[PDB]
Every structure is written in C-alpha cells, then in structure tokens.
Design a protein around this ligand. Structure first.
Ligand SMILES: N[C@@H](CCC(=O)O)C(=O)O
Ligand SMILES: N[C@@H](CCC(=O)O)C(=O)O
Ligand SMILES: [Zn+2]
Ligand SMILES: [Zn+2]
Lengths: 468, 467
C-alpha cells in the first residue's frame, strides 16, 4: 500500500498553470489509491522564495481545494537531516570527499567541452591516495556506480535508459556546509516515503541521478512519470504573452476553480467520451497511463465556455460564494437587493465570467445618479409618462410580490392600453436599470424592490418632464 | 388515437424562423405518437403567394429535413370542395344566406360603435323571404348564442369565450370565394387532424373554428398555441434583430441540426440538457413542457450550438453542407485536401461554415503575396536557414503523413539550435501566407509536399531582398 505522491514546486512568485496541473496529477493519484498527498517547498533559491512567493503557492492550492495530508516541508530547514545522511554515506563508502579546487574543476569542464565530450567529473578524488585531510576545506561527492545502467519505466514517456558512463559523481555538499539540490530531493522522497513521482518534463535528466543515490543508501526507489510541457497558442512553451499564466490571475479574471481544474485535466489526459468531469469523477477515472506524451496547446476560448457552463451547472449557492469576491472588486453595497444565489440565476446565461457578472449588476443593489445618455434619448417625451404612470401604480397593487404577478401586471399595460410591448417594457427597463440591456423585464423589476421600482420610475418621470 | 398534426403556413415570401419552430412541434408530435404530419398551403393571398414565395417554404422544410406524410395541399385548389360543403350546410339549419348590402353593414357598425361591440345582428338568421334569386349576397354561419366555448389549450391552459361575443361571421364573399376561417375548418376535418399546433395570434380564431366543428357533426381537435418569438427588446422577431429566414442561416453558415436544436429549446425545456439529436427530440418531447411565456432569441447561444455540431456530426456530413459555402467563396477545390478532412482541420477553430469556407483558400489555391505584417515578423533573414533545412527534410520522407512531417520539423530546430517557434512560424507564414493556421503537422501535410517547396522557395526568393 503506502501510496504517497508529492508536489514540490520551486517558488516562482506565483502558482504556474503548468505547476497546478502537475499538482493535480499527484493529488488525483493519491486520492485514487486512497493514499497521502505531501506538500514540499524548494525554497533553497533564497531570492525568489520570498514569503509572498511561498504563500502564493499555498493560496493557489487552497483555491483549487487541493488539500494535502502531510506538509508543507521546507528545504531551507532539514539541513541537519541532510548533513546527517551525508555523514552516513561517508562512513559506508557510497560517498567520498573531493579535494580539487575550483580552478581545476573549471579547467576540467572546458577541456571536456572542447574535446567534444559531456561535462562530467572524472574520478581523480574518487579513490585518491594523496592524503590532504582533516583541517583542509573540501567538498564531498557521491560515488556514482560505473558498471551497467539505470532504467526506469516512466508511466508517461515509457521506458527510459541512462548509461552510467554519462552520469558523473555529482557533488552533494559545497565548500560550505550547505548540500546540493539533488541530494535534498532524494532524502526528502526517502524520509517521506514517496512511491510515485509525478513532476514536469525538464526534471527527466536528474531522475537517473536521483535513482542511483536512492539505490546507494538502500531506499525504495519510486516509479517516475514526467508530464510533458504545456505549449501556448503558436506551439511555444506557455508564457505570459499567450494569456493568463497564474491560477490566481484566473481567479481575478472571474473564473471558478472547477472550470480551471477541469480544463487542465483535459490537457494531455483524456477519457475519450467526456469533456466535463466533477472532482470525485476525476478521482475515479484518472489513470497515469492515459496521460499523453505529446504537448497540448492552451485554448483560452474553450476555457471561457468551460467557465460559462460551470456557472449555470454548479449550485447557485456555491457560485454565489465565488461571486462575492468580484462583487467586492466592483465595490457594491449588496444590502438592499436580491440574494447572491438568486443573482447568478438572473445573469447566468448572459455573462460567461464572474467578473462580467459583478459588473452590469449595480442597479440591483444601488441607486444610479444619472441615466445612459443614449438610452435616455431613446425614451423621449412622447408617450413616455402615459405607459410609465399606469405600470408604476399597477405594480404596487399586489401584496404578493412575485415575478409571476409582475409579468401579467406588465402585460396589462400595452394590452389594456393599445400600444406595442416594446413601447412600455423598454422605458420600464431604462427606468429601473438606467440602460437598455437587462434580463427579463418581469424578473429584473422583481429582484429590485417595489420601493426602488416606483422610486426609479418616478425618477424617469421627473427627467422626461424637462421640455422647459 | 390516430394522431395527426398539421403545419399550414401562409406564404409570407420566405420561411420565418418562428414558423419553422411551429412546424417542428407538429412534426415532433406526429412522430412521437406514430402519426402523420400533413402539409397545407394558405395561398389564398395571391399577391404574396408567388411561385418563388411558395417554393422558399418547400425547400426550407427540406433543408431542415421535415418530411411530411400527406400534402402539400393548396387552398387555391379544392375551391369546388369549399363550395360543396357550404351548399350542403345551407341545406341544413346551421348556415343561412345573408342579403344585407355593404351600406347597411357600415351604418350598423357605426351605430353599434355609437351605442354601448361590432357584432353582426341576426337579421337574416330566420328570415322566410327569399330576398333574391341569383342577386349578389353573402353566406354566413349561424353561431350558437347560448353557453360558452371552452378549449383546453395544452400550452396556455383553459381558455373560454362567451358565445355572445362570437358573431355570425362571413363564410362566403359576394364573389363566391370563401373566407379564411372556413377554409381551415373544412381542411382539418377532411384531413382528420387530431392536434392543432399553430401560432399565438390564432387564439381568437379558435373559438370560431370550433363552433363550426361543433356544428355539421365534426370531431373537435385539441389545440395548443405556441407563444411568439420575441427579439432582443421584447418585440416580435423582425429583420432588425438579425437573420429571420431559415435560408438566411444557411447563407450565414449554419447547419440544419444546429438550428432545429435551438428552436426546440425556445420555450420547450427538458432539464439541464441542451443538445438533442433528431431521435432524442422525437422521444423526450412533451407538449405540456412548452412554456406559455415568450422566449427571446439569443444569437450567441445559436452560434455555440453550431460550433458543437460541426465537430460532433460526422465530418462527411458536414462536408456536404460546407460545399455550399466553398462555392460562395469561389475556391478551386481540385488540388487541396478532402472536404471531410478539411472539417477535421478547421473544426475547433471556427464556429460557422462561412467562417470555414473563409480562411482556407491557401489549402487549395496559391497566394500571390504574403500578409506582409506576419511576414515582417517571421520572414527576416534569420529564418532563411531554418527554411532551407525543413524543405530538404520534408522531402526525405517517402511516406507523407502528418507524423513524419512533425519529425521533420523536429529534426529542424535541433540540428540548428533554436526555439521551435522560430522555425514553425516562418514555415507557417510561408505556407499559409499569414500568422494563423491549425497545427503545422497537419497544415503543411494537407497542402502537399509539392506546393510546400513552391511556397518555401517563394519565401526564400522573397526574404532574399535584404538589399
Ligand atoms: N521543484 C521542482 C520539482 C522538483 C521535483 O518534483 O523533483 C519544480 O517546481 O519544477
Ligand atoms: N397560415 C397561418 C396558420 C394557420 C393555422 O395553423 O391554422 C400562419 O402562417 O400563421
Ligand atoms: Zn576532485
Ligand atoms: Zn343580412
């Protein structure tokens, strides 16, 4: 059993869309097999691993509701654990102590690159008989095996083979006490007992280096699965120029977490039949073998309509909880108006993003100072007060305030008084909304209270009464 | 129950979208209950019943694939049938022969409008005087005066009209021609129509048609009047809102499946489901589910409906409708890829068949000059060497497939170390002429190896203008 996946991002300042999909594959697989999902932070890069950068990762994880069972663990700590394993490998002989200077190390790399070889450190200090010990500063390296090769069955890329002759005895501790990054990964995956590694594509070169270290210090080597990169619109790697790149920028743009997670799953992974999956539906049907090795392009137009569906498909109460954030972005006093769960029922089919719903809704909660200049010139003086005064005093006739009673009440006008339906509904729309674009008239004027209805109808009557 | 629905449009010049939805409900109701769908023509208005105007109805029904079991019947014909029933009805006590002149009617209507509703009095209802022998006159129908008329409308509920509001309407003019309200009754009786599904404006004519059906011993059918289709501002659908004729949507690049699916959703609602096949619309259709309220026309959703059906329907069927818009663009489709294959390429990109006929000429015809704008960014001298290795590698493969094309562009940008976008984009501008196209694996494959080199070298002959 003990299935344990991991997500160990290096802080970039935010949560990259490609990194969120990687975390989703590691999170779906841990939940698929009833395992644990561990969170880890690669904050050794002290410049870009700011406290705001680390929070932007966890805040992005929480919005997508990708909760973790263990963590988060930080690589800036556990240094005493890292040096404890290094001292262990020095005693067992699996790691030696190099004494070459940086002058000879750079002269070795320039000679191999010139000679048409691969930059690898030869075993000069691997089995050196030259003494130079104790008080002298030095670095320690990992005695990489020389014979054979390492082959790991990648669930995404298939069988991958790396000859041991192209892997060097990598350094695992610098001149100072700090250990190198690759050694900080093998012990973390060992101490946390990771069984399935799901990371990006560019980490494939360090995978055979990490396996030979785990096999050395006697550790259960996990099965690796490297997901391909996400390409943009023109076939290049996904960047900020292709569109929104951070998961929180999509939250600012007016998206739902279910819409983004359902689209990132469809990038590479496929089920054939479906395009829309629920959270629990992704857990069951997810298979690493189904993820494609080819890179997928990012279609922002498809993601938008994916968001439009989830706005009207998800429960109106839950969509309202995400609508509240963009409501505060537009700064709207939502005390005197309809419910938020009832607001998404009105503006559901109209707009395709929550930002577009927070906008074009202020007339449901707040009064407007002026009218729309073009919409005001539409309902001029002729036959404007005649249909407005009869419908204003007819809406307040009922005690049961429902949109059904309003429809037949608005139906009374333009039918009892011979006139077109657009000759009263359009002036009524501009009266209560201020513009000439809104949902159904019977439903729009019902969400607005009967008080603010006659207040804004008489407001237009005082406006059309300006022939002087 | 031997269910029989009908669709009898009056030729307005074309096929209104609202009229097609009415024909769609009657066709669905007949196919749901294993009945017959009959077709009738109200071509009595000889001014707008042009042979071109009546044909636009026939081919519009055929475009939506709304085949009929009976018909088409024409009200221009069966005039002897219309004159034979009134003569039989004149023999019975249900229809008399009025004789009042046009002067008495206007003087009575203006007197009835002056007193405390214009309803013709029964002056000739029980007159024993022959009044004339062959002089001009008008035949009318004796309307019942006691009680009411009630018809259970399946959409608008129960509607009641008092018989005192229905006057003895005219059923035959002075020139012997019969009126419209009587022609509908005799047609629906000889054709054995069990369910009537028509527009909303015929709700006032329903009680008059039933009192004639209650007379002469006739089975009264069940009526169901659909609500009008309103536009963006709440008024009836007109040309100012957008496309109105069904054939205008074929010109604009739509499919019959996309238009029928959207008109079905207008009013009739079946849960969260939005996309139905023709067979699903036959099964799940319920006449009571049609809402009494009027629904506005959302051209944005209809565009999304068509985008789905382009990629959901078989590519060979979409190719048969795409052929009409290729002829509109006047594209020589002799050298390029197959039409059914073209739908696979431009499928997820465009949302209408006109948008597919456009932005596809470079697959079939060569372009004289480039877009310049996209060339100025990708035809720089730095790309003259990526283009010299792709064409030498594109021809190295004997098996011409999109996969072997990708491996050719993959050998490039690796031998000459550079980003893959720095070779595929100049290849995209050289082969397509602009900076937008599907995947380069299928774009240069569908165009061909011969026309590729002819366009790569065309770019090489152009990018060599650094002087
Ligand atoms: N921190 C690395 C991943 C390290 C790993 O998964 O081994 C990244 O964000 O790309
Ligand atoms: N011909 C009428 C319909 C007649 C009927 O359905 O009874 C129309 O086009 O509106
Ligand atoms: Zn050394
Ligand atoms: Zn008379």
């Amino acid at each position: 059993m003990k299935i344990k996946t991991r997500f160990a991002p290096s802080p970039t300042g935010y949560l990259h869309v490609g990194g969120a999909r990687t975390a989703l594959y590691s999170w779906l697989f841990a939940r698929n097999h009833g395992g644990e999902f561990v969170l880890r932070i690669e904050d050794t890069d002290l410049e870009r691993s700011t406290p705001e950068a680390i929070e932007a990762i966890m805040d992005g994880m929480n919005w997508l509701s990708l909760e973790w069972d263990e963590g988060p663990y930080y690589q800036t700590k556990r240094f005493d654990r890292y040096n404890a394993v290094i001292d262990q490998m020095l005693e067992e002989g699996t790691a030696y102590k190099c004494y070459c200077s940086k002058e000879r190390l750079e002269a070795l790399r320039e000679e191999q690159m010139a000679k048409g070889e691969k930059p690898r450190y030869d075993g000069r200090c691997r089995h050196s008989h030259e003494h130079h010990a104790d008080d002298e500063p030095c670095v320690v390296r990992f005695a990489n095996p020389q014979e054979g090769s390492v082959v790991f069955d990648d669930q995404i890329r298939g069988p991958i083979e790396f000859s041991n002759q192209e892997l060097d005895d990598l350094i695992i501790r610098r001149t100072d006490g700090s250990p190198t990054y690759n050694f900080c990964v093998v012990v973390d995956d060992w101490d946390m007992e990771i069984t399935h590694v799901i990371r990006g594509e560019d980490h494939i070169n360090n995978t055979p280096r990490q396996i030979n270290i785990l096999k050395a210090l006697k550790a259960p080597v996990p099965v690796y699965a490297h997901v391909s990169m996400i390409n943009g619109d023109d076939g290049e790697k996904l960047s900020k120029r292709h569109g929104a790149v951070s998961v929180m920028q999509y939250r600012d743009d007016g998206y739902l977490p279910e819409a983004l997670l359902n689209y990132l799953v469809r990038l590479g992974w496929s089920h054939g039949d479906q395009e829309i999956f629920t959270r629990e539906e992704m857990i069951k049907y997810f298979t690493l073998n189904a993820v494609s090795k080819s890179a997928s392009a990012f279609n922002t137009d498809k993601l938008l309509w994916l968001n439009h569906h989830y706005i009207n498909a998800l429960p109106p109460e839950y969509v309202a909880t995400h609508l509240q954030w963009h409501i505060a972005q537009e700064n709207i006093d939502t005390r005197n108006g309809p419910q938020l769960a009832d607001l998404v029922k009105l503006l559901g089919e109209r707009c395709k993003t929550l930002k577009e719903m927070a906008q074009s809704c202020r007339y449901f909660y707040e009064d407007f100072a002026e009218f729309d200049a073009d919409a005001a010139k539409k309902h001029l003086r002729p036959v404007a007060r005649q249909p407005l005064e009869v419908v204003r005093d007819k809406l307040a006739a009922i005690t049961d305030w429902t949109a059904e009673n309003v429809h037949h009440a608005i139906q009374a006008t333009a039918d009892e008084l011979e006139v077109g339906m657009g000759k009263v509904g359009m002036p009524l729309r501009v009266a209560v909304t201020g513009a000439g674009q809104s949902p159904a008239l019977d439903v729009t004027v019902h969400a607005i209270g009967k008080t603010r209805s006659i207040e804004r109808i008489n407001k237009a009557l005082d406006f059309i009464a300006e022939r002087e």
